[PDB]
């Protein structure tokens, strides 16, 4: 009935001159294993070593030398750390983007394959190693649709195993399957898949970030009409937000003793002193991390630097609110992802990376034994997208759909009204996909 039709999920169903883009002193083991498997199907391997945060202009000129090239594999995201900093700094994100941009500049007309190490986890037995490499998958999905010519696809591999590469890769790069989102494992090879889904109550205080703005504003007043005791709405503007006055009044009406606080979810301190400010009498029971990112444009120009900087509220807010609730017993920890991480549409390159992180963090939370929820939203309330298949969901329709998603206590539920007839043809117009097969 109504909601069921717009509820989906990711599964992983089983189905089956080159350059190697690699960092100096990184992947070595996986680069030699890649080279062996590649020439074993008749193709000269030559290494393309990359500098940390490469200038696309200098890389363009190093590709205008090597001569005719039939393809290029990337081990940038292989054997990588995350030096105790911002999750979407990740050199390999900044450099996949400046690599792709530079190939297109150097006019190779050959595609690019990015491999990642346990970025995906094919069902709830495997773990997500580093949620950031998920960003590679998001952005990579929206590069496909903006420039088919240059994007081969993504291929996830167990943390530190060259073995799965060695047999399959030959196939994956030349295979006529039309699989571009693959996961290699010991128990065979798996493909990324979109499928439809099968058929809670708030307590103490429940905190919502973005709570003074729209979306968070609807979550705030949904949470009250669903009978919440106490609501802590936070945002950079807090009480000084336009209509924050008429908001508390509107849901103080609906039996909710709510408070509106200024807070920079990006700053470890600003939230610590927000969490230490909730009365002992009314403890913190659930969070709804709805803080937004706003970065439009195309993958033409978009850089790792722009993504990282424009996504902090959503991303650092997640990593902060996770960090500072890990040792507290709370009901729901609800991250707001979107259809940009789910399938990814032209001009959502600025949104995909951030929501990919949120997707990964929930997975690796319920993995570690914590109550996470990574809702991949479609469009919401008040022309170019209404035509291309995706149509707006009313606030209440979306919220009620969340109500069940928590009842089930699913980790990564997709929630989106999609008129499929137009959407498929609009999504495949320029590049064939095998993702929506099972509908």
């Amino acid at each position: 009935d109504e909601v069921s039709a717009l509820r989906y999920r990711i599964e992983w169903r089983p189905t089956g001159t080159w350059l190697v883009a690699k960092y100096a002193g990184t992947a070595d083991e996986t680069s030699t294993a890649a080279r062996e498997a590649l020439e074993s199907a008749g193709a000269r391997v030559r290494e393309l070593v990359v500098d940390a945060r490469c200038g696309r202009d200098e890389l363009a000129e190093r590709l205008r030398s090597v001569g005719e090239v039939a393809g290029v594999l990337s081990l940038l995201a292989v054997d990588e750390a995350e030096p105790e900093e911002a999750p979407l700094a990740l050199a390999s994100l900044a450099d996949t983007l400046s690599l792709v941009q530079a190939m297109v500049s150097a006019e190779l007309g050959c595609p690019l394959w990015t491999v990642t190490e346990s970025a995906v986890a094919t069902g709830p037995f495997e773990r997500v190693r580093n949620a950031a490499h998920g960003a590679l998958w998001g952005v990579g999905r929206v590069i496909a649709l903006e420039n088919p010519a240059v994007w081969g696809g993504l291929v996830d591999v167990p943390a530190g195993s060259v073995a799965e590469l060695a047999r399959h890769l030959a196939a994956v790069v030349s295979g006529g399957a039309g699989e571009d989102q693959l996961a290699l494992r010991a128990d065979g090879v798996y493909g990324r898949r979109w499928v439809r889904a099968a058929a809670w109550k708030p307590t103490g205080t429940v905190l919502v970030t973005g709570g003074t703005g729209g979306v968070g504003g609807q979550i705030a007043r949904w949470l009250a009409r669903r009978g919440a005791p106490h609501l802590l709405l936070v945002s950079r503007s807090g009480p000084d937000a336009d209509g924050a006055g008429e908001l508390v009044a509107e849901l103080e009406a609906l039996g909710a003793r709510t408070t509106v606080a200024a807070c920079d979810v990006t700053d470890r301190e600003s939230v610590r002193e927000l969490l230490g400010g909730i009365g002992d009498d009314v403890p913190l029971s659930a969070v709804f991390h709805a803080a937004a990112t706003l970065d439009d444009g195309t993958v033409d120009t978009l850089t790792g630097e722009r993504i990282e900087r424009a996504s902090r509220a959503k991303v650092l807010g997640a990593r902060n609110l996770h960090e500072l609730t890990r040792e507290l017993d709370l009901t729901a920890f609800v991250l707001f992802s979107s259809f940009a991480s789910a399938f990814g549409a032209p001009g959502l390159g600025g949104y995909a990376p951030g929501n990919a992180y949120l997707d990964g963090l929930a997975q690796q939370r319920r993995s570690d034994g914590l109550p996470a929820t990574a809702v991949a939203w479609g469009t919401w309330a008040g022309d170019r997208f209404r035509r291309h298949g995706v149509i707006e969901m009313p606030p209440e329709t979306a919220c009620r759909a969340l109500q069940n998603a928590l009842d089930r206590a699913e980790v990564c539920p997709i929630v989106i009204d999609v008129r499929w007839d137009r959407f498929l043809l609009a999504y495949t117009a320029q590049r064939p996909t095998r993702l929506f097969d099972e509908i």
Partner: antibody, heavy 122, light 111 residues
Framework: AEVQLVQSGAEVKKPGSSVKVSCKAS????????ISWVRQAPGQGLEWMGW????????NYAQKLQGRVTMTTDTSTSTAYMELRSLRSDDTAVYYC??????????????WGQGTTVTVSS | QTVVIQEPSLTVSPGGTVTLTCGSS?????????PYWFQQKPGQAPRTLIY???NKHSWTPARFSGSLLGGKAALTLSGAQPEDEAEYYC??????????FGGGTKLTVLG
């Protein structure tokens, strides 16, 4: 960086009329960026007016303006326009456009127009 | 309605260091407020010296520096020169794609 912005020449207006100031963006790609506008009354501070998206024509306006200001982009001429209706005397100011440099943020103020002086008087 | 306060005016001697601050009425200015620093010599348009609390452009002189000093944003001029006589504006990012400028500091360098 080597993105410049060049604005319309000076304008003099009477109360109740309109002004459409232009900001043409040469020297780099135009499409993946928001042009932001700011004004400054004689010998007073910079005030934020709003931003127009060159990507999807979206707009956020300063409340005190809403209903009097319209920001538009011409992807063709690679220029942004700011248009202020029903002017009164306190709308006298120098109006500035600003955006990111060449591989910079969406809503940014790194690069500035040269300004357009608009005088409104009886 | 958020108000951003700078010192109206400050005077430094050549070689001196002077430190401007940018507070907000709504709370602690912090790096999610994406503080910018702008310089406006008389007759001219703003030039931008600092973005993202502390990042310099190539045209920013070394002697300028952006920081968070206890709840405000801070620009610090070290070994000031006559050519730095200017108005300095800070700009902060809030809420629903809102931005609010400080009133400016008139920095005088005694030449």
């Amino acid at each position: 960086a080597e993105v410049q912005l060049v604005q319309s020449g000076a304008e003099v207006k009477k109360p109740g009329s309109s002004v459409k100031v232009s900001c043409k963006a040469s020297g780099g790609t135009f499409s993946s960026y928001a042009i932001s506008w700011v004004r400054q009354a004689p010998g007073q501070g910079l005030e934020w007016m709003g931003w127009i998206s060159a990507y999807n024509g979206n707009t956020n306006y300063a409340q005190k303006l809403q209903g009097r200001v319209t920001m538009t982009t011409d992807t063709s001429t690679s220029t942004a326009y700011m248009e202020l209706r029903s002017l009164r005397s306190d709308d006298t100011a120098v109006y500035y456009c600003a955006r990111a440099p060449n591989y910079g943020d969406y809503v940014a103020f790194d690069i500035w127009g040269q300004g357009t002086t608009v005088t409104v008087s009886s | 309605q958020t108000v951003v306060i700078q010192e109206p005016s400050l005077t430094v001697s050549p070689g001196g260091t002077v430190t401007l601050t940018c507070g907000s009425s709504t709370g602690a200015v912090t790096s999610g407020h994406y503080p910018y620093w702008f310089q406006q010599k008389p007759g001219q348009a703003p030039r931008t010296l600092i973005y993202d609390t502390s990042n310099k452009h190539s045209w920013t002189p070394a002697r300028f520096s952006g920081s968070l000093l206890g709840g405000k944003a801070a620009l610090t001029l070290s070994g000031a020169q006559p050519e730095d006589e200017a108005e300095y504006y800070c700009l902060l990012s809030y809420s629903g794609a809102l931005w609010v400028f400080g009133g400016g500091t008139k920095l005088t360098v005694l030449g």
